[PDB]
Design a protein around this nucleic acid. Structure first.
Ligand SMILES: [Zn+2]
Ligand SMILES: [Zn+2]
Ligand SMILES: [Zn+2]
Ligand SMILES: [Zn+2]
Ligand SMILES: [Zn+2]
Lengths: 252, 46, 97, 53, 36, 209, 142, 114, 155
RNA sequence: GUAUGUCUAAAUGCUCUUAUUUACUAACAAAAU
C-alpha cells in the first residue's frame, strides 16, 4: 500500500542516472544529440534499471501538491528526484485514473500529448483518436537472450511482469507470431506498463544468464493493432455497445 | 463564464512564431453557390 | 579522389573509422569484406553483424535476379551466387551459441 | 542624420524582458564568455545544418 | 522531351515566411501629395 | 483577424475568474498540423499543470469539440463514441495524411455528426431517439481478469487463459483459501456434462496451436 | 519601472559553465536560444570591443546583460570619457611606449594566434585566483 | 567546406606516420581499395557494335566504365588496361585494351570495330 | 569580489577579522561555479539556487555586522560595498521595511513576472497555508525558480 | 566544377620498398610568326 508502505523512493541516484548517447556514427551531432556520419548498430539496448514497484512506489512532492500525472522516470525505474519528484510514484490505481479521466483523451498518464495519427511502428504514446489499453509485446527472443524456453513459461513471465504493473484485462502469448498481447482495464495503466517495460529484460535472477542481461536487446513494447480473428472482434463490438449504452444512461 | 486573455512576453532569442514552418497547403475552393456563366446564342477557314 | 570512393578510402577517413572502432565500438560491417572462414570470430555481436550483412546481400541478389531480360546469363550466374550466399548464411547460423 | 523616432535600442528591449538579468563582470571574463558562447552558437548552428564534418 | 512549353501560371497563398528581405526594408516612408 | 477559443465548461474549470495567455501561431494543431494560436490556462492559480489547447479552432468547429478535452462540445463524449451514437440512430474519417489532413481542416463542412451536436434541434432529437431505443484453485466457465480479481477480493497472482477458459488462482496462503471457501463458474482444488465437454474442446483448441 | 536586479557574477559564470557539454533533451530550448542569439552576436562583439580596457587600465569591470539560458552576453555599458582627460591619458601611454622602445633592444612582439587551435580557451576561473595582474602602462609622474 | 580548401582539420593527436600504418593495417580488410575494376568515365574511341543486341554505339559516346590493370604488360615498363563498358540497350559487358604499339586500342570479347 | 589592481586601498582596519569568515564563502562559490553534470533540469536549477543563496548569505553576514551588530567601521563597509563582496541594492532593500528577509532582488521585480506581481516566496507561509486549508489541498509551493526561497517573507 | 540515383527488417604483432601515379575529375577554355 504505497502511501503507508513508504515515503522514500530514490530509484537510481543522480551520480549514475544515464550516459547520454551510444556510439553509432563517427562524430557526435551537438544539436540532435545523435551520432552522425554513419548508421551501423541495432540501437535498442536493455534498460539498466527497472520498476520493482512494491519496493519503490511512494509518496512524492507531487502527491502532497495534487499532481495528476505519473512519473515516466519512475515507471522506467530511474527517478533520481525520488521523494522530491513532482510527478507521482505508484502504479496507477483506480481512483487516480478516475481523477485524470477528463484529460486522458488528449494526453497520457504522463501528461504528454497523445497524437492524432499513430506512429507507423505503433511504437510510442498512443493516439487520442483510437483509445487503447492493449500493448503489443515483441522482441521476446532478444529480451530473454535467445533462451530455449517453453512458450507457457514466457507467458507466465509476461503475466508476472505486467500484472504487477497494472490491473490486467487479458493476456495472450503466441508461438507463431512470437509475441505477447496484453490488454488492461484502464488506458493510463497500459501506458504506464508500456513505459516501464520498454527495453526491459524478461529474465529473472534464478536464470543462468542474469549477469549478461545488459548485453542483449530489451523488450519491444508497442501498441496493439487490433486482432483480426472473429471472436475477438465480436467481443470488442460488444464492449463498444456496452460503452455506448453507459454513455446514453449518463446522458439521460 | 468570463475569461481574461493575456499575451506573455516570450524570450527574444527563441523564434517569435514557433508555430509556422513554411508549410505547403492546398485549399479547397468551397464554392457552394453556383455561378450562372450566362451568354447569348465557315469552319474550314478557321 | 573524384567519384566518392576515393574520398571514402582517403587516409583521414580511415583513421577516423579506426578511432571510432577503438573508442565506443562503431564498426561499419558494410565497409569491410565478410570473412571466409567462420570460427575465427570469438565475439557474438560481430558474428551477428556478419550474418545480417550476408542476409542483406542475399536480399539484394534476389531483388535483381527477377528482372525482365531473364534469358541473359548474368541472372543465371547470380542464381549460383544466390546459392553461395544462402550457404554462407547457413554456415553463419553455427551452433556454438 | 540619425533617427528622430527610435529611442528603443536593442539592449533596452532585452532588459525590459524577464529572460535577461544583469551583472558586473571583469572585461576579460566577459570576452571569454563571448568567445565560448559564440563558439557554441557556431557549432550549434552548424550541427543543425547537419554538416557535422 | 521535357524541354516543354506551357499552359498557365499560378497564384496560391500560404503562411508568410517572416524573412527580412533587403528591398522590403523601409524606405520613402513619406508619401508626397498634390496641391489641391 | 482571429476567431475565439472553444473550451468546454468542465475543461476550463469551476471558477468565476481564469487568466490565460494566447500564443499566436504557437503550435501546430494535432489533427491538422497547421499553425494556430495556443491558449493555455492554469485553471486555479496554484493548481499545478497547465491546460494548453491542442487543436486549431477550425478543426474543433468541424468536430464540434472542446479544444482541450477533445470531447463533444455538448455531451462531453469522445468523438468516436458521440459519432457512433449518432450513427446508431455515419462517423467521421479523419484522413491521417501529411497534406490531406490540412486540406480537410480548411474545408468548413463540420465533418460528420458535428452539425447535429451543434444545433439544439438536432442534438436534442438524437437524444430523444436514443432514449426511445433504450426503452489454490482452478476456475472454469468471456470476461476480464480485473473483474475476476474484484470478485475474488469481495469473496475474501491470478492467471486466466481465454482460449483455454482455465483460471488457476494461487493465493499462496492456506488461510486466504480456507476463508474464501466458507464465505461462498466451476471451482475445484489443485448441465455439468455439457460444461465438461466444452472445457475439453477449449483445451484441445488451446493445444492444437 | 523598478530597475534590474544586480545579479551576482557567480551565477552568470555557473550558467556559462553548464552550457559547455550541452547534449541532453534538457536544454533543447537553450540550444534554440543560442541559435537565435546569432542575430545579436555582432552587436555583442561591438559592445565588448568598445569596452576594451585602455593601456592605462589593468582590468576593467564592466556592466553585463546575459540571457538566463546562457546563450549570449552583452557588455551593457558604453564607455564615455572626459575628452581632454582621455587625450592626456593617451598621450601619456604614447610617451610610455616610446620610452619602452628606447629601452628595449628587442621588444617581444606577440605571436598570433595567442592560444593554440587545438587548445580550448581557458575559463576565467583559472586566473581569477592568479596573482595581481602585472602593472599597466602609465608613465613616471612628478 | 569549399572545394579549394587549404587545410583539412586533424584531431589533436594525429601521428601521421602512425595513422598511415593503421590505415594500411585496415586496407587489407577494407572492401573498396582491395579490389579490381575501379570505375572511370570515358568516351568510346573505337565506335563499335555491341555483339549481343547490335546496338551501334558511336564514336565519342560517354560511359561509366571500369578500368582494370592487365598484369601482362606491353614490352616491359608501359602498362595496358582493360576498359569495360555496357551497351545502352542490352547489358552486355563490352571492353577493350590499349596496346600502345600502334598508338591505338584492341577489342576484347565485347564488340567489333566498324 | 573583484580583483585588486591598486585602484582602492588594500582594505580598511577590521577586514582581517571578517576576511576568514567570508573566505569560506569563496571556496563554496568555487565549488558551485563549475560543470556539475546535472543531467536533469531540476538538478541544474538547484546549483543555481545554491549559488544565489550563497551570494545572499555573504551580504547578510556583512549587513548584519554593519547594521544590526554594528561591529565594523563605516569606511570598511563602504569599501566592501565598492568591491563585489556585498550586494548594495539588496542591502538597501533589507534596510527598508517589509523586505528584511529577502532572498533576492529579482524575486521582487514585478515587471519580470508573467502575472504582474511579486514572487510567491514573498507571500508569508501563513497566507498560502490558510488558502490551502480553505481549498482542501496541502501546502502548494516549496521554492521559486529564481532562487531557492522556502518562505522568504519577513514573518 | 569532381554528377547522380535506387538498394538497407530491429588472427596477432613484425618489418621491408620508394629520385613515381593501376591515380582520379573534367563541369572550364581553346591561337600563332
Ligand atoms: Zn520522478
Ligand atoms: Zn473541454
Ligand atoms: Zn524569496
Ligand atoms: Zn529570490
Ligand atoms: Zn521567490
Amino acid at each position: 500500500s504505497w502511501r503507508d508502505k513508504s515515503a522514500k523512493v530514490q530509484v537510481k541516484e543522480s551520480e549514475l542516472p544515464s550516459s547520454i548517447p551510444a556510439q553509432t556514427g563517427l562524430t557526435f551531432n551537438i544539436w540532435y544529440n545523435k551520432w552522425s556520419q554513419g548508421f551501423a548498430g541495432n540501437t535498442r539496448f536493455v534498460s539498466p534499471f527497472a520498476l520493482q514497484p512494491q519496493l519503490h512506489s511512494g509518496k512524492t512532492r507531487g502527491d502532497n501538491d495534487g499532481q495528476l500525472f505519473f512519473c515516466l522516470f519512475f515507471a522506467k525505474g530511474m527517478c533520481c528526484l525520488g521523494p522530491k519528484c513532482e510527478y507521482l510514484h505508484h502504479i496507477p490505481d483506480e481512483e487516480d485514473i478516475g481523477k485524470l479521466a477528463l484529460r486522458t483523451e488528449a494526453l497520457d498518464c504522463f501528461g504528454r500529448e497523445k497524437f492524432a495519427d499513430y506512429r507507423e511502428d505503433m511504437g510510442g504514446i498512443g493516439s487520442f483518436r483510437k483509445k487503447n489499453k492493449t500493448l503489443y509485446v515483441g522482441g521476446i527472443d532478444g529480451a530473454l537472450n535467445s533462451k530455449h524456453l517453453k512458450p507457457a513459461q514466457i507467458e507466465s513471465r509476461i503475466r508476472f511482469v505486467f500484472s504487477r504493473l497494472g490491473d490486467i484485462d487479458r493476456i495472450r502469448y503466441v508461438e507463431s507470431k512470437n509475441c505477447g498481447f496484453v490488454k488492461f482495464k484502464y488506458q493510463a495503466n497500459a501506458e504506464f506498463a508500456k513505459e516501464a517495460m520498454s527495453n526491459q529484460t524478461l529474465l529473472l535472477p534464478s536464470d543462468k544468464e542474469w549477469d549478461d542481461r545488459r548485453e542483449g536487446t530489451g523488450l519491444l513494447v508497442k501498441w496493439a493493432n487490433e486482432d483480426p480473428d472473429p471472436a475477438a472482434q465480436k467481443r470488442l463490438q460488444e464492449e463498444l455497445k456496452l460503452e455506448s449504452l453507459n454513455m446514453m444512461v449518463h446522458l439521460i | 463564464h468570463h475569461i481574461e486573455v493575456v499575451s506573455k512576453q516570450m524570450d527574444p532569442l527563441l523564434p517569435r512564431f514557433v508555430g509556422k514552418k513554411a508549410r505547403k497547403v492546398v485549399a479547397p475552393t468551397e464554392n457552394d453557390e453556383v455561378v450562372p456563366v450566362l451568354h447569348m446564342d465557315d469552319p474550314n477557314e478557321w | 579522389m573524384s567519384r566518392n570512393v576515393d574520398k571514402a578510402n582517403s587516409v583521414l577517413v580511415r583513421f577516423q573509422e579506426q578511432q571510432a572502432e577503438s573508442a565506443g565500438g562503431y564498426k561499419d560491417y558494410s565497409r569491410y569484406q565478410r570473412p571466409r572462414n567462420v570460427s575465427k570470430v570469438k565475439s557474438i555481436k560481430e558474428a551477428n553483424e556478419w550474418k545480417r550483412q550476408v542476409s542483406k546481400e542475399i536480399k539484394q541478389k534476389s531483388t535483381r535476379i527477377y528482372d525482365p531480360s531473364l534469358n541473359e546469363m548474368q541472372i543465371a550466374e547470380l542464381n549460383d551466387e544466390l546459392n553461395n550466399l544462402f550457404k554462407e548464411w547457413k554456415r553463419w547460423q553455427w551452433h556454438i551459441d | 542624420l540619425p533617427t528622430n523616432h527610435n529611442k528603443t535600442k536593442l539592449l533596452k528591449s532585452l532588459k525590459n524582458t524577464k529572460y535577461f538579468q544583469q551583472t558586473t563582470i571583469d572585461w576579460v571574463e566577459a570576452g571569454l564568455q563571448l568567445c565560448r558562447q559564440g563558439h557554441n552558437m557556431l557549432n550549434l548552428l552548424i550541427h543543425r545544418k547537419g554538416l557535422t564534418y | 522531351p521535357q524541354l516543354e512549353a506551357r499552359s498557365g501560371a499560378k497564384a496560391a497563398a500560404y503562411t508568410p515566411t517572416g524573412i527580412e528581405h533587403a528591398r522590403l526594408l523601409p524606405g520613402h516612408t513619406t508619401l508626397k501629395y498634390r496641391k489641391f | 483577424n482571429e476567431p475565439p477559443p472553444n473550451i468546454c465548461e468542465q475543461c476550463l474549470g469551476d471558477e468565476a475568474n481564469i487568466r490565460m495567455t494566447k500564443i499566436p501561431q504557437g503550435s501546430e494543431c494535432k489533427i491538422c498540423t497547421l499553425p494556430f494560436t495556443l491558449y493555455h490556462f492554469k485553471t486555479s492559480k496554484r493548481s499545478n499543470n497547465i491546460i494548453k489547447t491542442l487543436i486549431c479552432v477550425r478543426c474543433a468547429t468541424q468536430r464540434n469539440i472542446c479544444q482541450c478535452c477533445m470531447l463533444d462540445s455538448r455531451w462531453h463524449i469522445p468523438i468516436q463514441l458521440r459519432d457512433h451514437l449518432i450513427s446508431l440512430v455515419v462517423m467521421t474519417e479523419e484522413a491521417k495524411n501529411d497534406m490531406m489532413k490540412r486540406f480537410l481542416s480548411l474545408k468548413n463542412v463540420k465533418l460528420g455528426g458535428a452539425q447535429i451536436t451543434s444545433d439544439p434541434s438536432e442534438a436534442d432529437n438524437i437524444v430523444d431517439k436514443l432514449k426511445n431505443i433504450l426503452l489454490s484453485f482452478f476456475l472454469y466457465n468471456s470476461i476480464p481478469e480485473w473483474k475476476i480479481t474484484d470478485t475474488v477480493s469481495q469473496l475474501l497472482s491470478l492467471i486466466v487463459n481465454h482460449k483455454a477458459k482455465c483460471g488457476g488462482l494461487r493465493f499462496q496462503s492456506s488461510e486466504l483459501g480456507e476463508r474464501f471457501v466458507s464465505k461462498i463458474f466451476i471451482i475445484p482444488w489443485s448441465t455439468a456434462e455439457n460444461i465438461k465437454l466444452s472445457l475439453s474442446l477449449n483445451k484441445l483448441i488451446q493445444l492444437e496451436l | 519601472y523598478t530597475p534590474k536586479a544586480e545579479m551576482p557574477p557567480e551565477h552568470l559564470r555557473k550558467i556559462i559553465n553548464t552550457h559547455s557539454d550541452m547534449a541532453s533533451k534538457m536544454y533543447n530550448t537553450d540550444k534554440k536560444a543560442f541559435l537565435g542569439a546569432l542575430k545579436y552576436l555582432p552587436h555583442a562583439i561591438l559592445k565588448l570591443l568598445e569596452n576594451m580596457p585602455h593601456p592605462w587600465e589593468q582590468a576593467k569591470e564592466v556592466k553585463v546583460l546575459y540571457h538566463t539560458s546562457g546563450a549570449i552576453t552583452f557588455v551593457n555599458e558604453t564607455p564615455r570619457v572626459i575628452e581632454p582627460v582621455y587625450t592626456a591619458q593617451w598621450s601619456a601611454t604614447w610617451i610610455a611606449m616610446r620610452r619602452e622602445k628606447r629601452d628595449r633592444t628587442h621588444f617581444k612582439r606577440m605571436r598570433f594566434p595567442p592560444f593554440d587551435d587545438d587548445e580550448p580557451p581557458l575559463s576565467y576561473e583559472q586566473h581569477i585566483e592568479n596573482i595581481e595582474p602585472l602593472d599597466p602602462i602609465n608613465l613616471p609622474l612628478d | 567546406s569549399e572545394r579549394k580548401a587549404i587545410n583539412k582539420y586533424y584531431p589533436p593527436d594525429y601521428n601521421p606516420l602512425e595513422a598511415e600504418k593503421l590505415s594500411r593495417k585496415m586496407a587489407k580488410k577494407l572492401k573498396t581499395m582491395n579490389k579490381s575494376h575501379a570505375s572511370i568515365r570515358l568516351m568510346t574511341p573505337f565506335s563499335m557494335r555491341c555483339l549481343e543486341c547490335n546496338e551501334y554505339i558511336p564514336k565519342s559516346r560517354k560511359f561509366n566504365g571500369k578500368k582494370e590493370l592487365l598484369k601482362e604488360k606491353y614490352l616491359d615498363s608501359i602498362k595496358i588496361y582493360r576498359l569495360t563498358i555496357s551497351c545502352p540497350r542490352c547489358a552486355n559487358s563490352i571492353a577493350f585494351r590499349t596496346d600502345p604499339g600502334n598508338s591505338d586500342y584492341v577489342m576484347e570479347v565485347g564488340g567489333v570495330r566498324n | 569580489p573583484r580583483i585588486k589592481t591598486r585602484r582602492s586601498k588594500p582594505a580598511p582596519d577590521g577586514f582581517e577579522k571578517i576576511k576568514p569568515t567570508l573566505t569560506d564563502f569563496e571556496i563554496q562559490l568555487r565549488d558551485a561555479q563549475k560543470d556539475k553534470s546535472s543531467k536533469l533540469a531540476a538538478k541544474s536549477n538547484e546549483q543555481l539556487w545554491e549559488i544565489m543563496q550563497l551570494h545572499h548569505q555573504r551580504s547578510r553576514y556583512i549587513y548584519t555586522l554593519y547594521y544590526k551588530r554594528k561591529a565594523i567601521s563605516k569606511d570598511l563597509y563602504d569599501w566592501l560595498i565598492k568591491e563585489k563582496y556585498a550586494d548594495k541594492l539588496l542591502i538597501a532593500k533589507w534596510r527598508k521595511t517589509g523586505y528584511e528577509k529577502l532572498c533576492c532582488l529579482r524575486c521582487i521585480q514585478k515587471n519580470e513576472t508573467n502575472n504582474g506581481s511579486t514572487c510567491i516566496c514573498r507571500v508569508p507561509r501563513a497566507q498560502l497555508e490558510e488558502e490551502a486549508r480553505k481549498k482542501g489541498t496541502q501546502v502548494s509551493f516549496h521554492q521559486c525558480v529564481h532562487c531557492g526561497c522556502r518562505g522568504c517573507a519577513s514573518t
